[PDB]
Scaffold this active site. Structure first.
Site, short mmCIF file in Angstrom:
data_model
loop_
_atom_site.label_atom_id
_atom_site.label_comp_id
_atom_site.label_asym_id
_atom_site.label_seq_id
_atom_site.Cartn_x
_atom_site.Cartn_y
_atom_site.Cartn_z
N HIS A 1 0.99 -1.26 0.00
CA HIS A 1 -0.33 0.33 0.07
C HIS A 1 0.52 1.41 0.18
O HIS A 1 0.88 1.88 1.34
CB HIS A 1 -1.03 -0.13 1.29
N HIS B 1 1.60 5.28 -2.53
CA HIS B 1 1.22 6.05 -3.21
C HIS B 1 2.55 6.50 -3.67
O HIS B 1 2.96 7.53 -3.73
CB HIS B 1 0.66 6.96 -1.99
N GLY C 1 -2.06 12.74 -2.03
CA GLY C 1 -2.94 13.90 -1.13
C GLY C 1 -3.53 14.70 -1.79
O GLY C 1 -3.77 14.25 -2.60
N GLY C 2 -3.38 16.01 -1.75
CA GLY C 2 -4.88 17.15 -2.60
C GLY C 2 -6.25 17.37 -1.98
O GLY C 2 -6.54 18.24 -2.25
N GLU C 3 -6.10 16.38 -0.63
CA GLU C 3 -7.11 16.71 -0.15
C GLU C 3 -7.54 18.50 0.33
O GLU C 3 -8.13 18.59 1.07
CB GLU C 3 -7.23 15.47 0.88
N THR D 1 -7.77 9.49 -2.94
CA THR D 1 -9.07 10.52 -3.65
C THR D 1 -8.63 11.58 -4.52
O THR D 1 -9.71 10.88 -5.46
CB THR D 1 -8.66 11.85 -1.98
N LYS E 1 -8.53 -0.67 -6.45
CA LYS E 1 -8.68 -0.28 -5.54
C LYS E 1 -10.34 0.76 -5.40
O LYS E 1 -10.80 0.63 -6.31
CB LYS E 1 -7.84 0.90 -5.34
N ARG F 1 -15.18 11.03 2.46
CA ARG F 1 -14.08 11.21 0.40
C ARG F 1 -14.28 9.89 -0.60
O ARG F 1 -14.39 10.11 -1.54
CB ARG F 1 -12.68 10.47 0.79
N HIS G 1 -10.22 1.07 1.24
CA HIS G 1 -9.59 1.76 2.04
C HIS G 1 -11.18 2.00 2.78
O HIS G 1 -11.64 2.66 2.64
CB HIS G 1 -9.97 3.18 1.23
N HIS H 1 -6.22 -0.30 6.10
CA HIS H 1 -6.51 0.33 7.05
C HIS H 1 -7.47 0.27 8.83
O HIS H 1 -7.74 1.37 9.14
CB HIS H 1 -7.16 2.30 7.34
N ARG I 1 -7.66 1.77 12.20
CA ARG I 1 -8.13 3.00 12.58
C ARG I 1 -9.25 3.46 13.86
O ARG I 1 -9.20 4.87 14.22
CB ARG I 1 -8.79 3.52 11.09
N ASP J 1 0.82 2.61 3.93
CA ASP J 1 -0.07 3.66 3.34
C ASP J 1 0.84 4.51 2.86
O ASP J 1 1.11 6.00 2.90
CB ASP J 1 -0.55 4.82 4.02
ZN LIG Z 1 -6.48 4.95 2.37
ZN LIG Z 2 -3.80 5.27 0.75
#
Ligand SMILES: [Zn+2]
Ligand SMILES: [Zn+2]
Ligand SMILES: [Zn+2]
Ligand SMILES: [Zn+2]
Ligand SMILES: [Zn+2]
Ligand SMILES: [Zn+2]
Ligand SMILES: [Zn+2]
Ligand SMILES: [Zn+2]
Lengths: 375, 375, 375, 375
Positions: free
Chosen positions: D68, D70, D75-77, D106, D162, D169, D201, D230, D233, D285
């Site tokens: 997992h 990226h 990001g970008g949120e 996202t 995915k 989100r 996710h 996750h 969490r 992640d």
């Molecule tokens: Zn995730």
């Molecule tokens: Zn992720």
């Protein structure tokens, strides 16, 4: 006892090695499908769990690379009953072919790149090495992802595009369509690490190579990415082909076309014309409309026999020249680090054994490894 | 009593047979819609449950093949009220037509290949034989599957494509569009086993056949797949047409156009020009804007009557030449193995009986079999 | 001498005939691939140029209709090496199959309906009778024209659509998607003159027939258009299939599935349950290890030999029941006017000869007519 | 002197080996990036041109598999300034990662699968092993070929898809949409020879695992293909994940989430709950503040040091369990024939060297092989 069998150690001893370059009597050591040493007198005990193969009195050379095969079948020009069947593994290996490039012809209605791609992958799994060209006779090209540039850049096995020109079965493409297609393949090759070539099926039209020359004036694709095939199909074409090679192009002679310019004859003429062997390739058009693969080896035999070629030279068009042209790394030459794709032949050039990626595929001239559904 | 009626045995006896070739007084035996024997004096008892038809004193010849009919209706050039109605079965059969090729014209907005295809199938079921061309005046072509090549290869009844050139109603097609379309039809024909022809509606533009010549220089479709129709519509065109035929092309004369070059006149001229009848066809443009089908038979009559043609020759443009041009197997000739599509006429060439696939469709000059909704 | 050979007159004399209905010792007269007379003692000279076949001591029955064959190859579930090869003509004929319905399975990525359609057509040209289903496991369906309704209505060889439910290889279709697809097939078949069926590959999910019941509650497609196949794959599913049949549905048993419900056992139980044979069919799943066609004949033999079924009854699921379900006109029964698709067997139900459309395809148990590329 | 350097012979001597299985002091012999022998006391001279590495006092284990990451940035949120940068080679290797699975989150507007695919390929060329998931948070999936099934089947590096659920989100997917996507992934993987998994996710919604349960009730995709990630969490979600695992599912714990359920704690509790380690994986992640990879090693250390896990057991979630879940052949365990992806650590579990495919990537805890643009 420690087990070292996972390495697949194999020592091929005593043959007269043609790399294709003549290396005299020389040994070949393999491990894990790769050539790890090439030298005279390698010790039979240099590595544990070694299979030693005594090849004295035989010839050892690189496996053939046939860049023009209708892997999934072809034909269909006289209706549906003329659609040929897919190619079987054993037919390739028995003919000395260890690497192949699959493509489509006239029919891209009942034939699809997706099917071609699956077959390509199946052969890789079955033990040989295979790639494909996207497109078919039809222009604009019918692709997998919708773009020639994208197919070449993103689909791992795709290395270029196919098309038809100067033929009564073409799609009547104009210069712009041809140029753009060629350019997309060129760009896609750069991004994907592929040769990014454009292969032109040539027909009997009097326009002959004209379209290619026209294309070159209308774009900036290098001459070295454009491959006219079937050049021996008619005289004027062949002759034009010779000039094109003289300008820096590479030309592909078809083994299955015996008239009016025979394959060996074409190759000899090209050399006599001053074209380096590096710019001459030979392919079968196998499984098309069914053309077989025996004419490959036969051409080699004829060149040596009737044309004064040395064995080394005679092999180039099926090995080093193709690999070089398509940038097939690890193929076409017997060097440490390359794939163990090798032929074992008698001094009269008859196939005895074939190894692909180090696996014995054919023994005593007979396939000992067959396709999944081969009968 | 054993029942043998399933065979539909029918013996047509005593007519003067024109195959189209003159065969003198000769008998025709039919079974299952097919011609099973052609010979003088067939025994009336050679097969059980036989319907014997005495045709002494009459003429027997092949049914006509009209390759240019707006089956679903046409027109619409002066607005919606000018859209013609679909063609009725009886109108074809009474005119001696047993095989037809349907197509679209100017209007391909309110007219669709899918409708044309349904009508084509309806007629086949009703008893005659029918095919169609995809496309219409508009270029690029409006197709069923989205590709001219695919329509021809995959839709059973489609045999080629239609287009318009040199006409104020065309789509102003350029050479590339025309070439590609022609090439797609050619390729689709090969894969589907269809003639794969391109039919060109010709208009009165001074450019006349130019576009075709241009096309030939821009592609490799054989001349024998390109059919200019309406060639007798104006003089210069007709003349140009003669040269095109001399180069190996086939030309289609329109029976419904009486000036400035009448149909019989055109045919005679072509012959006098040295063109074999095999490369001359005649079609009606029936049901267009409503043109009927009587001019077909009338042309035949005129040729014999005023132009010194023998009956045999006079029939070719409506029978053997068309069948030959479109590769309509089993049609256009009276031979064992062919379909029993036949006309029975008086010695003065008036239609008495019509058989389609062996079924009596018209008797005493009147349809005795009608369309499903015919009134 | 008058030649009447075009008729292909063939008289099959003195076999014990199962139509499937037991007709005793009876003769069969064939012309133009059609059965034209069935009766005891047909005079060997009733028609000219007649080939007479002494079947005395033999059995005559209708050719089998196999409605579930992967004509172009199937498999692919374990990667590309698992893609099976296309079906060869002789394999079908030797198995007694004269009519086939081709379809796709799991893989509709490397397998396409256009390919399937071409293969279907080749087989018809080669001598047998073939149709196909559009779609494949995937829902929504992958079609030729972009619409299930359109495919069924306009592609001549297409008779319905295939899908998969209650199987870990499904597309997880919801009821609306299934209902819409069945409804499209239904409507398209009325328009096209096809049965318009929906065939459901059943897997091992505990939900079993549920989705079918759900469907029926959500649409107005008649139950007689819905075919669940592979019903013998598990007990609970099998038991539900009986209730389904009981309600008016037809169920398809797979000959290549031996456990837990053998094919003969399957058919026997249906009969024990009170289901009319008319509502039970048997198909092979041939070419889908790699499935053959011998299980069809095997089943018939077992039913007669170990289960006490009459030959006539044993034959139904392969002949009259299939023709009946798919509305295959001219097939499944021996009657004047029907196609001359016949099996000649030894009293021990071993196939000796096979006629497809009146042509001898198999003689002495071996194909005498082969596919174009069979070697 | 014969050169055998092409083999890259490397002998790793005398480390205490955790395969992950404790194998005690044991040697490892590598050739061509493959492990060819594992045994105590391998003779330092067993093969020529062998590099011998004294690991006495050290620990040897398999390289970590981080499923997992990226790879291209995430990001970008919080707007465009929050788009993180792409991952650099050395960051992975120094963290002990030799195999990675890249995915999107996202943002699938400024982030594309084609970019991800390119980056994946660069990493393989650079020395490690990389695959990817198609799709991203958005459902329906944003794919490369237009189909999830097609992406998984034909893009070599793609192994599944995915999505996001129970998170503010998400795309508010309904069950049909989820079921169809999972089913496509599943089928595409059989065809392509991929695991065909669906990775979810998970966010903080109270609905927690529900959508997964819903899904299972609406399709036949096996539970072993569904990966919730996750899971640590939130407590309630975590507790449901245990039950999920209990039923046969595998759960993925995120190393970068410290509260409310720390990673080691997470793994400990699974074990306390009776879940086999085979069904528990740990991922980072990484690159998704901005997530690093040190938490992977940290977790292993904590488990051994504060939780009483054996080293072998501690290693599973990062090695054998991952390879196992994703069917990553040749990875996750030290056996002859497997890839030579190894970690050399100090007895205190500090990484000293890293080999990826038999190449030294990290030495003395610092990368000696860097990404092409690393500075
Ligand atoms: Zn995730
Ligand atoms: Zn992720
Ligand atoms: Zn070619
Ligand atoms: Zn070719
Ligand atoms: Zn017109
Ligand atoms: Zn017209
Ligand atoms: Zn099935
Ligand atoms: Zn099946």
């Amino acid at each position: 006892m420690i087990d070292y069998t996972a390495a697949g150690f194999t020592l091929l001893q005593g043959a007269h090695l043609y790399a294709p370059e003549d290396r005299g009597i020389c040994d070949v050591l393999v491990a894990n499908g790769k050539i790890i040493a090439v030298a005279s007198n390698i010790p039979s005990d240099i590595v544990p769990n070694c299979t030693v193969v005594d090849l004295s009195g035989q010839i050892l050379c690189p496996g053939f690379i046939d860049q023009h095969v209708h892997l999934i079948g072809g034909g269909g020009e006289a209706g549906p009953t003329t659609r040929t069947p897919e190619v079987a593994l054993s037919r390739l290996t028995e003919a000395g072919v260890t690497s192949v490039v699959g493509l489509l012809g006239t029919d891209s209605i009942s034939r699809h790149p997706e099917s071609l791609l699956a077959k390509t992958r199946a052969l890789n799994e079955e033990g040989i090495s295979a790639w494909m060209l996207t497109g078919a006779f039809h222009v604009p090209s019918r692709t997998i992802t919708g773009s020639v540039e994208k197919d070449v850049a993103i689909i791992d096995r795709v290395i270029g595009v196919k098309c038809a020109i100067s033929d009564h079965r073409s799609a009547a493409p104009d210069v712009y369509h041809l140029a753009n297609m060629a350019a997309e393949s060129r760009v896609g090759g750069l991004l994907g690490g592929k040769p990014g070539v454009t292969v032109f099926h040539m027909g009997d039209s009097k326009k002959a190579l004209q379209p290619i020359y026209d294309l070159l004036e209308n774009c900036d694709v290098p001459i070295s990415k454009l491959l006219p095939t079937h050049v021996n199909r008619n005289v004027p074409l062949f002759e034009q082909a010779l000039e094109f090679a003289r300008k820096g192009g590479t030309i592909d002679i078809t083994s299955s076309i015996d008239e009016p310019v025979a394959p060996a004859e074409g190759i000899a003429r090209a050399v006599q014309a001053g074209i380096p062997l590096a710019r001459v390739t030979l392919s079968s058009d196998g499984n098309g409309s069914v053309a077989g693969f025996e004419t490959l080896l036969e051409t080699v035999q004829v060149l040596v026999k009737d044309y004064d070629f040395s064995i080394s030279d005679a092999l180039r068009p099926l090995t080093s020249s193709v690999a070089g042209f398509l940038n097939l790394t690890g193929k076409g030459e017997i060097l440490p680090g390359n794939d163990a794709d090798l032929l074992v032949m008698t001094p009269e050039l008859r196939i005895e054994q074939v190894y692909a990626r180090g696996k014995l595929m054919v023994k005593d001239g007979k396939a000992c490894v067959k396709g999944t559904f081969e009968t």
